[PDB]
Amino acid sequence: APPLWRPGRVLARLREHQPGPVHIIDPFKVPVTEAVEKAAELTRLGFAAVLLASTDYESFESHMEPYVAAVKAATPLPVVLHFPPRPGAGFPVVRGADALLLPALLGSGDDYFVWKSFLETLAAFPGRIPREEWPELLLTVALTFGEDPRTGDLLGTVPVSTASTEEIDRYLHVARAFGFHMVYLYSRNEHVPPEVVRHFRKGLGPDQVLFVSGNVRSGRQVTEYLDSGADYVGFAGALEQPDWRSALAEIAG
Amino acid sequence: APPLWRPGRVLARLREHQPGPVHIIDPFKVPVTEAVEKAAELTRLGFAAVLLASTDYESFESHMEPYVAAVKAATPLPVVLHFPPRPGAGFPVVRGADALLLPALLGSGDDYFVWKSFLETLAAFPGRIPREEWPELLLTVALTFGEDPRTGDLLGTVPVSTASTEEIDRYLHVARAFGFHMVYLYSRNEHVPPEVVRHFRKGLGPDQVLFVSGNVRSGRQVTEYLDSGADYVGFAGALEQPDWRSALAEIAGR
Ligand SMILES: CC(C)=CCC/C(C)=C/CC/C(C)=C/CSP(=O)(O)OP(=O)(O)O
Ligand SMILES: CC(C)=CCC/C(C)=C/CC/C(C)=C/CSP(=O)(O)OP(=O)(O)O
Ligand SMILES: [Cl-]
Ligand SMILES: [Cl-]
Ligand SMILES: [Cl-]
Ligand SMILES: [Mg+2]
Ligand SMILES: [Mg+2]
Ligand SMILES: [Mg+2]
């Protein structure tokens, strides 16, 4: 019986693994051959997982089933999907993925993105994927920082205000009381402030995983976030160029 | 596709119907023949729905499928089920019920009762019930007031603090942001304070339904709660006795 929304192997690994950077591969932009090359290096660096994520997607199932299979044949790290949900479908899913990160956008003015996407997703389970083969679900509070009209237009999010800690303190009460597995602090166009990362680490339970991403391009940035309490520092764009091997070594340093 | 968690016919009915009392029949204590007699009177009184609810239950599907059918044969009012969920199963459900009230116990120290029961329930859908025939789900923020070790032991709830509005204001933000359909204020052993009812009415969206229940035994109490903002005032125990007709008449404000 699939753990589904209950803690399983992937969450256990994220809870126990040494904190560090995590490369995020956008499967709708990165050719699969390049993802496979990258996955082999991520393995050598001992990263906790390979995340495949993108704001945009189409023909999810026919594209992702073989992409996930190719990445999984290239690394023993778990492959975790992270994409926004769509009303009428819920979150996208394909067989073979180890886990799907389910973001509850608590800062959204649209209740579907705050959490009803989770009900639609679970109602649709198991669909065309054998139950035994379904991915695990990582229940995550997802928060956005800085001006970001793209996520705002698409998902209804409003940038979190840190002029006081009232707004984030409410999200931390939800994260704790609702037993979320992870919190994901994201900034599409700016940087999540290290002080907000510290505030979250201090307010979360010891087993709640803290992920931060957005415009991380240097090892100094990774270090600052980990020093602030992030368990994982995600980065995508820094490697979306020909000289990615150099960029990866500087970020993983 | 059944509406399921999306608004449907029952929530529309509750939103549009005028505020008033609602009798709650405990089907694991009330014989079905008495429930059927009761259901016929509730209809004449103009109540908005008939709730079948209980903290305790056993052999739910064999007892409730026919119990629901018997009640529905006696009244055209929607029949709504309200029972706590159980790990491994989620909320109990039978074919024929018009809706299930799904309580998210925000005051519980156990995340399963705060909301993961909702995930287990939806993962299990549709189970043995034809999909087209599933009840609608009324997403509800459920809060408890006063000392109540029974619900505390069973569901992990802690009485809501009414010393200030700090705790209830966080629940109101959740009720609004999460788009809950209803809020249910309950007191097993005391009375929900009318001022808390007012505070919720004022902070909720116009389409969010406010239910209050617990030890309501007089028409005066129903009036006070409606005057404070409740959409529906529930009552069960007052009618679990032989002279229930007279009690019902008094509570309905006859
Ligand atoms: C808003 C949110 C957290 C969750 C909702 C669901 C969405 C939009 C998922 C897409 C996955 C993400 C956040 C990809 C951007 S990697 P990055 O932008 O951090 O990469 P970068 O290193 O800046 O290129
Ligand atoms: C705690 C909560 C709201 C939801 C969690 C799920 C539970 C325990 C559902 C049982 C349904 C209830 C609250 C029945 C009591 S009617 P009453 O006790 O109000 O009737 P009374 O008129 O006092 O007899
Ligand atoms: Cl794993
Ligand atoms: Cl802060
Ligand atoms: Cl909130
Ligand atoms: Mg993309
Ligand atoms: Mg399902
Ligand atoms: Mg009972």
Coordinates of C-alpha atoms and ligand atoms in Angstrom, one line a residue:
Chain A
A1 CA 0.0 0.0 0.0
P2 CA 1.7 3.3 -1.1
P3 CA 2.6 5.6 1.7
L4 CA 1.2 8.5 -0.5
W5 CA 0.7 11.4 1.8
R6 CA 2.3 9.6 4.7
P7 CA 6.1 9.8 5.3
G8 CA 8.0 7.3 3.2
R9 CA 11.5 6.6 1.9
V10 CA 12.2 9.9 0.2
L11 CA 11.2 12.1 3.1
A12 CA 13.3 9.9 5.4
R13 CA 16.3 10.5 3.1
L14 CA 15.7 14.2 3.0
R15 CA 15.4 14.3 6.8
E16 CA 18.6 12.4 7.4
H17 CA 20.9 13.6 4.5
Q18 CA 23.5 16.2 5.1
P19 CA 22.3 19.7 4.2
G20 CA 23.5 21.0 0.9
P21 CA 22.7 22.2 -2.6
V22 CA 20.2 20.5 -4.8
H23 CA 20.2 20.9 -8.6
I24 CA 16.8 21.4 -10.2
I25 CA 16.5 20.3 -13.8
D26 CA 13.7 21.8 -15.9
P27 CA 12.7 18.8 -18.0
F28 CA 10.7 20.9 -20.5
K29 CA 13.8 23.1 -21.3
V30 CA 16.8 20.8 -20.7
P31 CA 17.4 18.1 -23.3
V32 CA 17.3 14.6 -21.8
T33 CA 20.8 13.8 -22.8
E34 CA 22.0 16.8 -20.9
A35 CA 19.9 15.9 -17.9
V36 CA 21.5 12.4 -17.9
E37 CA 25.0 13.9 -18.0
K38 CA 24.1 16.3 -15.2
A39 CA 22.5 13.5 -13.1
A40 CA 25.8 11.5 -13.2
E41 CA 27.6 14.5 -11.7
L42 CA 25.0 15.2 -9.1
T43 CA 25.5 11.6 -7.9
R44 CA 29.2 12.1 -7.5
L45 CA 28.5 15.3 -5.5
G46 CA 26.3 13.2 -3.2
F47 CA 23.3 15.6 -3.5
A48 CA 20.2 14.4 -1.6
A49 CA 17.9 14.1 -4.7
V50 CA 17.4 15.2 -8.3
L51 CA 14.4 17.6 -8.6
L52 CA 12.7 17.9 -12.0
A53 CA 10.6 21.1 -11.9
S54 CA 9.1 23.8 -14.1
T55 CA 6.4 26.4 -13.9
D56 CA 5.4 25.5 -17.5
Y57 CA 4.5 22.1 -19.0
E58 CA 2.5 20.4 -21.7
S59 CA 1.9 16.7 -22.7
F60 CA 3.2 15.9 -19.3
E61 CA 2.8 12.2 -19.4
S62 CA 4.2 11.3 -22.8
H63 CA 7.1 13.7 -22.2
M64 CA 7.9 12.8 -18.6
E65 CA 7.6 9.0 -18.4
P66 CA 10.7 8.4 -20.5
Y67 CA 12.5 11.5 -19.2
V68 CA 12.1 10.2 -15.6
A69 CA 13.2 6.7 -16.7
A70 CA 16.4 8.1 -18.4
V71 CA 17.4 10.2 -15.3
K72 CA 16.6 7.2 -13.0
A73 CA 18.9 4.9 -15.1
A74 CA 21.7 7.5 -14.6
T75 CA 21.5 8.0 -10.9
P76 CA 20.5 6.2 -7.7
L77 CA 19.3 9.5 -6.2
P78 CA 15.5 9.8 -5.8
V79 CA 13.8 11.8 -8.6
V80 CA 11.3 14.3 -7.3
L81 CA 8.8 16.1 -9.4
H82 CA 7.7 19.7 -8.6
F83 CA 5.2 21.4 -10.9
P84 CA 2.0 23.5 -10.3
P85 CA -1.4 21.9 -10.4
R86 CA -4.2 22.7 -12.8
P87 CA -7.9 22.8 -11.9
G88 CA -9.6 19.7 -13.4
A89 CA -6.4 17.6 -13.1
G90 CA -4.6 18.4 -9.9
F91 CA -0.9 17.9 -9.8
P92 CA 0.7 16.1 -12.8
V93 CA 2.1 12.7 -12.2
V94 CA 4.0 9.9 -14.0
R95 CA 5.0 6.4 -13.1
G96 CA 8.6 6.0 -12.1
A97 CA 9.0 9.2 -10.1
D98 CA 10.1 8.6 -6.5
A99 CA 8.1 11.5 -5.1
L100 CA 6.0 14.5 -6.0
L101 CA 6.5 17.7 -4.0
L102 CA 2.9 19.1 -3.4
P103 CA 3.1 22.8 -2.8
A104 CA 0.3 24.4 -0.7
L105 CA 0.6 28.1 -1.7
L106 CA -0.5 29.7 1.5
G107 CA 0.0 33.1 0.1
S108 CA -2.4 32.6 -2.8
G109 CA -5.6 34.5 -3.1
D110 CA -7.0 31.4 -4.9
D111 CA -8.1 28.6 -2.5
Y112 CA -7.4 25.9 -5.2
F113 CA -3.7 26.8 -5.1
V114 CA -3.7 27.3 -1.3
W115 CA -4.7 23.5 -1.0
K116 CA -7.7 22.3 -2.9
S117 CA -5.4 21.1 -5.6
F118 CA -4.4 18.5 -3.0
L119 CA -8.0 17.2 -2.7
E120 CA -8.3 17.0 -6.5
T121 CA -5.0 15.1 -6.7
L122 CA -5.9 12.6 -4.1
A123 CA -9.5 12.2 -5.5
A124 CA -7.9 11.3 -8.8
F125 CA -5.5 8.7 -7.3
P126 CA -4.5 6.1 -8.6
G127 CA -5.7 6.8 -12.1
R128 CA -3.6 5.0 -14.8
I129 CA -0.6 4.3 -12.5
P130 CA -0.5 1.0 -10.6
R131 CA -1.0 1.8 -6.9
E132 CA 2.1 0.0 -5.9
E133 CA 4.1 2.2 -8.3
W134 CA 2.8 5.6 -7.3
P135 CA 5.3 8.2 -6.1
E136 CA 5.3 9.3 -2.5
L137 CA 3.9 12.8 -1.7
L138 CA 5.9 15.4 0.1
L139 CA 3.3 17.9 1.7
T140 CA 5.0 21.3 1.4
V141 CA 4.1 24.9 2.4
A142 CA 5.3 27.0 -0.6
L143 CA 5.9 30.7 -0.2
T144 CA 7.0 33.3 -2.7
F145 CA 9.1 36.3 -2.2
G146 CA 9.7 39.5 -4.2
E147 CA 7.8 40.9 -7.1
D148 CA 6.7 38.0 -9.3
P149 CA 3.9 38.6 -11.6
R150 CA 4.3 35.3 -13.4
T151 CA 3.6 33.2 -10.4
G152 CA 1.0 35.8 -9.3
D153 CA -0.9 35.7 -12.6
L154 CA -0.7 31.9 -12.8
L155 CA -1.3 30.8 -9.2
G156 CA -2.7 33.8 -7.4
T157 CA 0.3 34.3 -5.1
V158 CA 1.1 37.6 -3.4
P159 CA 4.7 38.2 -2.3
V160 CA 5.1 37.4 1.4
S161 CA 5.6 40.6 3.4
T162 CA 8.4 40.6 5.9
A163 CA 7.8 44.2 7.3
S164 CA 6.7 42.3 10.4
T165 CA 6.7 38.5 11.1
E166 CA 3.0 38.4 11.4
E167 CA 2.3 36.8 8.0
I168 CA 5.1 34.2 8.2
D169 CA 4.2 33.5 11.8
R170 CA 0.8 32.5 10.7
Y171 CA 2.3 30.2 8.0
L172 CA 4.6 28.6 10.6
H173 CA 1.5 27.9 12.9
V174 CA -0.1 26.1 9.8
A175 CA 3.2 24.3 8.9
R176 CA 3.5 22.9 12.5
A177 CA -0.2 22.2 13.3
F178 CA -1.0 20.7 9.9
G179 CA 2.1 18.5 10.0
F180 CA 3.6 19.6 6.8
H181 CA 6.7 17.7 5.7
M182 CA 8.6 20.6 4.2
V183 CA 8.5 24.4 3.6
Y184 CA 9.8 25.7 0.3
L185 CA 10.8 29.5 0.2
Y186 CA 11.1 30.7 -3.3
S187 CA 12.0 33.9 -5.1
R188 CA 11.6 34.0 -8.9
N189 CA 13.2 37.4 -9.5
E190 CA 14.9 38.3 -6.2
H191 CA 16.5 36.4 -3.3
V192 CA 14.8 35.0 -0.3
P193 CA 16.3 36.9 2.7
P194 CA 18.6 34.8 4.8
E195 CA 16.9 36.2 7.9
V196 CA 13.5 34.8 6.7
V197 CA 15.3 31.4 6.3
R198 CA 16.5 31.7 9.9
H199 CA 13.1 32.6 11.2
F200 CA 11.6 29.5 9.5
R201 CA 14.3 27.2 10.8
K202 CA 13.7 28.4 14.3
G203 CA 9.9 28.1 14.1
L204 CA 9.8 24.6 12.4
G205 CA 9.9 21.2 14.0
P206 CA 13.3 19.3 13.8
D207 CA 12.0 17.0 11.2
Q208 CA 10.4 19.6 8.9
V209 CA 12.7 20.1 5.9
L210 CA 13.4 23.6 4.7
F211 CA 14.1 24.2 1.0
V212 CA 15.1 27.6 -0.4
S213 CA 15.6 28.5 -4.1
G214 CA 15.7 31.3 -6.5
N215 CA 18.6 33.0 -8.2
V216 CA 21.3 31.0 -6.3
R217 CA 24.4 31.2 -8.5
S218 CA 27.4 31.0 -6.2
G219 CA 28.7 28.7 -3.5
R220 CA 28.8 31.7 -1.2
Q221 CA 25.0 32.0 -1.5
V222 CA 24.6 28.3 -0.7
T223 CA 26.8 28.6 2.3
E224 CA 24.9 31.6 3.6
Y225 CA 21.5 29.8 3.3
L226 CA 22.7 26.6 4.9
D227 CA 24.4 28.7 7.7
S228 CA 20.8 30.3 8.1
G229 CA 19.2 26.9 8.6
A230 CA 18.1 25.8 5.1
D231 CA 18.4 22.0 4.7
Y232 CA 18.5 22.3 0.9
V233 CA 19.4 25.1 -1.5
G234 CA 18.0 24.6 -4.9
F235 CA 19.4 26.0 -8.1
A236 CA 18.4 25.6 -11.8
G237 CA 19.3 28.5 -14.1
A238 CA 23.0 28.6 -13.2
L239 CA 23.4 25.3 -15.1
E240 CA 21.2 26.1 -18.1
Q241 CA 24.2 27.1 -20.2
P242 CA 27.1 25.3 -22.0
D243 CA 29.7 25.8 -19.3
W244 CA 27.5 24.2 -16.6
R245 CA 30.2 21.9 -15.4
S246 CA 32.2 25.0 -14.1
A247 CA 29.2 26.6 -12.7
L248 CA 28.3 23.4 -10.8
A249 CA 31.8 23.1 -9.3
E250 CA 31.6 26.7 -8.1
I251 CA 28.2 26.3 -6.6
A252 CA 29.0 22.9 -5.0
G253 CA 32.2 24.3 -3.4
Chain B
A1 CA -18.0 13.8 -12.1
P2 CA -19.6 14.3 -8.6
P3 CA -18.8 17.7 -7.2
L4 CA -17.2 16.0 -4.1
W5 CA -15.1 18.8 -2.5
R6 CA -16.5 21.5 -4.9
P7 CA -19.7 23.4 -3.9
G8 CA -22.8 21.5 -4.9
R9 CA -26.5 21.4 -4.3
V10 CA -26.5 20.9 -0.5
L11 CA -24.1 23.8 0.2
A12 CA -26.2 26.0 -2.1
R13 CA -29.3 25.0 -0.1
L14 CA -27.6 25.8 3.2
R15 CA -26.4 29.2 1.8
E16 CA -29.8 30.3 0.5
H17 CA -32.1 28.9 3.2
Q18 CA -33.1 31.3 6.0
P19 CA -31.2 30.8 9.3
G20 CA -32.7 28.5 11.9
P21 CA -32.5 25.4 14.1
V22 CA -31.4 22.1 12.8
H23 CA -32.1 18.9 14.6
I24 CA -29.2 16.4 14.8
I25 CA -30.3 12.8 15.0
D26 CA -27.6 10.5 16.6
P27 CA -28.2 7.3 14.5
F28 CA -26.3 5.0 16.8
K29 CA -28.6 6.0 19.7
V30 CA -31.9 6.8 18.1
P31 CA -33.9 3.8 16.8
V32 CA -34.6 4.2 13.0
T33 CA -38.4 4.2 13.6
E34 CA -38.1 7.2 15.9
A35 CA -35.7 8.9 13.4
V36 CA -38.4 8.4 10.7
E37 CA -41.1 10.0 12.8
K38 CA -38.8 12.9 13.7
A39 CA -37.8 13.4 10.1
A40 CA -41.4 13.9 9.1
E41 CA -41.8 16.7 11.6
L42 CA -38.6 18.4 10.7
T43 CA -39.9 18.8 7.2
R44 CA -43.1 20.5 8.4
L45 CA -41.0 22.9 10.6
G46 CA -39.1 24.0 7.6
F47 CA -35.5 23.1 8.8
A48 CA -32.9 23.2 6.2
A49 CA -31.5 19.7 6.4
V50 CA -31.5 16.7 8.7
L51 CA -28.0 15.9 10.2
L52 CA -27.2 12.3 11.3
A53 CA -24.2 12.7 13.6
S54 CA -22.4 10.9 16.4
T55 CA -18.9 10.9 18.0
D56 CA -19.2 7.0 18.5
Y57 CA -20.1 4.6 15.7
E58 CA -19.5 0.9 14.8
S59 CA -20.6 -1.2 11.8
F60 CA -21.2 2.1 10.0
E61 CA -22.0 0.8 6.5
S62 CA -24.4 -2.0 7.6
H63 CA -26.3 0.3 10.0
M64 CA -26.2 3.6 8.0
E65 CA -26.9 2.6 4.5
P66 CA -30.5 1.5 5.4
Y67 CA -30.8 4.2 8.1
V68 CA -30.1 6.9 5.5
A69 CA -32.5 5.3 3.1
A70 CA -35.3 5.2 5.7
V71 CA -34.8 8.8 6.6
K72 CA -34.7 10.0 3.0
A73 CA -38.0 8.1 2.4
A74 CA -39.5 10.2 5.2
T75 CA -38.2 13.7 4.3
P76 CA -37.2 15.6 1.1
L77 CA -34.7 17.5 3.1
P78 CA -31.0 16.8 2.4
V79 CA -29.5 14.2 4.8
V80 CA -26.0 15.2 5.9
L81 CA -23.6 12.9 7.8
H82 CA -21.2 14.2 10.5
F83 CA -18.8 11.7 12.1
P84 CA -15.1 11.8 13.1
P85 CA -12.6 10.0 10.8
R86 CA -10.4 7.1 11.8
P87 CA -6.8 6.5 10.6
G88 CA -6.7 3.7 8.0
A89 CA -10.2 4.6 6.8
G90 CA -10.8 8.3 6.7
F91 CA -14.4 9.6 7.2
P92 CA -17.2 7.0 7.1
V93 CA -19.5 7.1 4.1
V94 CA -22.5 5.3 2.7
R95 CA -24.3 5.5 -0.6
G96 CA -27.4 7.7 -0.5
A97 CA -26.3 10.5 1.9
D98 CA -26.7 13.9 0.3
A99 CA -23.5 15.3 1.9
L100 CA -20.8 14.5 4.4
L101 CA -19.7 17.4 6.7
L102 CA -15.8 17.0 6.8
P103 CA -14.5 18.7 10.0
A104 CA -10.9 20.0 9.9
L105 CA -10.2 20.2 13.7
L106 CA -7.8 23.1 13.6
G107 CA -7.5 23.0 17.4
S108 CA -6.2 19.4 17.4
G109 CA -2.7 18.5 18.4
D110 CA -2.9 15.5 15.9
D111 CA -2.4 16.5 12.3
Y112 CA -4.5 13.6 11.1
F113 CA -7.5 15.3 12.7
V114 CA -6.5 18.8 11.8
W115 CA -6.7 17.7 8.1
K116 CA -4.9 14.6 6.9
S117 CA -8.1 12.6 7.3
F118 CA -9.3 14.7 4.3
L119 CA -6.4 13.2 2.2
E120 CA -7.0 9.7 3.3
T121 CA -10.8 10.1 2.5
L122 CA -10.2 11.5 -0.9
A123 CA -7.5 8.9 -1.7
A124 CA -10.0 6.2 -0.9
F125 CA -12.7 7.7 -3.1
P126 CA -14.9 6.2 -4.7
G127 CA -14.4 2.9 -3.0
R128 CA -17.6 0.7 -3.2
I129 CA -20.0 3.6 -3.8
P130 CA -20.9 4.4 -7.5
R131 CA -19.1 7.7 -8.3
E132 CA -22.2 9.4 -9.6
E133 CA -23.9 8.5 -6.3
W134 CA -21.4 9.9 -3.9
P135 CA -22.4 12.5 -1.3
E136 CA -21.1 16.1 -1.7
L137 CA -18.4 17.2 0.8
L138 CA -18.9 20.2 3.0
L139 CA -15.4 21.4 3.9
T140 CA -15.7 22.6 7.5
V141 CA -13.5 24.2 10.1
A142 CA -14.5 22.5 13.4
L143 CA -13.7 24.0 16.7
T144 CA -14.4 22.9 20.3
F145 CA -15.2 25.0 23.4
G146 CA -15.0 24.2 27.0
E147 CA -13.5 21.2 28.9
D148 CA -14.1 18.1 26.9
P149 CA -11.8 15.2 27.6
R150 CA -13.9 12.9 25.4
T151 CA -13.2 14.7 22.2
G152 CA -9.7 15.6 23.5
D153 CA -8.9 11.9 24.1
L154 CA -10.4 10.8 20.8
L155 CA -9.4 13.5 18.4
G156 CA -6.6 15.4 20.2
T157 CA -8.6 18.7 20.5
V158 CA -7.7 21.4 23.1
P159 CA -10.5 23.8 24.0
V160 CA -10.3 27.0 22.0
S161 CA -9.0 29.9 24.1
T162 CA -11.6 32.7 24.4
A163 CA -9.3 34.9 26.7
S164 CA -8.4 37.0 23.7
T165 CA -9.1 36.6 19.9
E166 CA -5.5 35.5 19.0
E167 CA -6.4 31.9 18.5
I168 CA -9.7 32.3 16.8
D169 CA -8.3 35.0 14.6
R170 CA -5.8 32.6 13.2
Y171 CA -8.6 30.1 12.6
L172 CA -10.6 32.8 10.7
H173 CA -7.6 33.5 8.5
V174 CA -7.4 29.8 7.7
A175 CA -11.2 29.5 7.2
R176 CA -11.1 32.4 4.7
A177 CA -7.8 31.8 2.8
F178 CA -8.5 28.0 2.5
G179 CA -12.0 28.7 1.3
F180 CA -13.7 26.5 3.8
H181 CA -17.5 26.1 3.2
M182 CA -18.5 26.2 6.8
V183 CA -17.4 26.7 10.3
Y184 CA -18.8 24.5 13.1
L185 CA -18.5 25.8 16.7
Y186 CA -19.2 23.1 19.2
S187 CA -19.2 22.6 23.0
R188 CA -19.8 19.1 24.3
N189 CA -20.2 20.1 27.9
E190 CA -20.7 23.9 28.0
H191 CA -22.0 26.5 25.6
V192 CA -20.2 28.2 22.8
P193 CA -20.1 31.9 23.9
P194 CA -22.5 34.0 21.8
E195 CA -19.8 36.7 21.5
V196 CA -17.5 34.1 19.7
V197 CA -20.4 33.4 17.4
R198 CA -20.6 37.1 16.6
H199 CA -16.8 37.3 16.1
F200 CA -16.9 34.5 13.6
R201 CA -19.9 35.9 11.7
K202 CA -18.1 39.2 11.3
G203 CA -14.9 37.7 10.1
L204 CA -16.2 35.1 7.8
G205 CA -17.0 35.6 4.1
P206 CA -20.8 36.1 3.3
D207 CA -21.0 32.7 1.7
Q208 CA -19.4 30.8 4.6
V209 CA -22.0 29.0 6.7
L210 CA -21.8 29.3 10.4
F211 CA -23.1 26.3 12.5
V212 CA -23.2 26.3 16.3
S213 CA -24.2 23.3 18.5
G214 CA -23.9 22.0 22.1
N215 CA -26.4 21.9 24.9
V216 CA -29.0 24.0 23.1
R217 CA -32.3 23.1 24.8
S218 CA -34.6 26.1 24.5
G219 CA -36.0 28.3 21.8
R220 CA -34.4 31.3 23.7
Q221 CA -31.0 29.8 23.2
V222 CA -31.6 29.3 19.4
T223 CA -32.8 32.9 19.2
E224 CA -29.7 34.2 21.0
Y225 CA -27.4 32.3 18.7
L226 CA -29.2 33.4 15.5
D227 CA -29.2 37.0 16.8
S228 CA -25.4 36.6 17.2
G229 CA -24.9 35.5 13.7
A230 CA -25.3 31.7 13.5
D231 CA -26.8 30.4 10.3
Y232 CA -27.8 27.2 11.9
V233 CA -28.2 26.1 15.5
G234 CA -28.0 22.4 16.0
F235 CA -29.5 20.3 18.8
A236 CA -29.6 16.6 19.5
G237 CA -30.0 15.6 23.1
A238 CA -33.1 17.7 23.8
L239 CA -35.1 15.3 21.7
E240 CA -33.5 12.0 22.9
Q241 CA -36.4 11.4 25.3
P242 CA -40.1 10.3 25.1
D243 CA -41.6 13.8 25.2
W244 CA -39.5 15.0 22.2
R245 CA -42.5 16.4 20.3
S246 CA -43.1 19.1 23.1
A247 CA -39.4 19.8 23.3
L248 CA -39.1 20.2 19.6
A249 CA -42.1 22.6 19.5
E250 CA -40.5 24.8 22.2
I251 CA -37.0 24.8 20.6
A252 CA -38.5 25.6 17.1
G253 CA -40.0 28.7 18.6
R254 CA -43.6 27.5 18.0
Ligands
LIG1 C1 5.9 28.9 -6.3 C2 6.3 27.5 -5.7 C3 7.5 27.4 -4.8 C4 5.7 26.4 -6.0 C5 4.5 26.3 -6.9 C6 4.7 25.3 -8.0 C7 5.7 25.7 -9.1 C8 5.6 27.1 -9.8 C9 6.7 24.9 -9.4 C10 7.8 25.1 -10.4 C11 9.0 24.7 -9.7 C12 9.9 25.8 -9.4 C13 9.6 26.7 -8.2 C14 10.8 26.0 -10.3 C15 11.8 27.1 -10.3 S1 13.6 26.6 -9.9 P1 14.4 28.3 -9.4 O1 13.6 29.4 -10.1 O2 14.5 28.6 -8.0 O3 15.7 28.3 -10.2 P2 16.8 29.4 -10.4 O4 17.9 28.8 -9.8 O5 16.5 30.7 -10.0 O6 16.9 29.3 -11.9
LIG2 C1 -15.9 18.1 17.3 C2 -16.5 18.4 16.0 C3 -17.4 19.6 15.8 C4 -16.3 17.6 14.9 C5 -15.5 16.3 14.9 C6 -16.3 15.2 14.5 C7 -17.4 14.7 15.5 C8 -16.9 14.4 16.9 C9 -18.6 14.6 15.0 C10 -19.7 14.2 15.9 C11 -20.9 15.1 15.6 C12 -21.2 16.0 16.7 C13 -20.4 17.2 17.0 C14 -22.3 15.6 17.4 C15 -22.8 16.2 18.7 S1 -24.5 17.0 18.5 P1 -24.5 18.1 20.2 O1 -23.5 17.4 21.1 O2 -24.0 19.5 19.9 O3 -25.9 18.0 20.7 P2 -26.5 18.3 22.0 O4 -27.6 19.2 21.5 O5 -25.6 19.0 23.1 O6 -27.0 17.0 22.5
CL3 CL 15.1 7.3 -1.4
CL4 CL 12.0 37.7 9.1
CL5 CL -3.1 31.2 7.0
MG6 MG 10.2 25.9 -17.1
MG7 MG -9.0 8.6 -4.9
MG8 MG -23.3 9.2 19.8

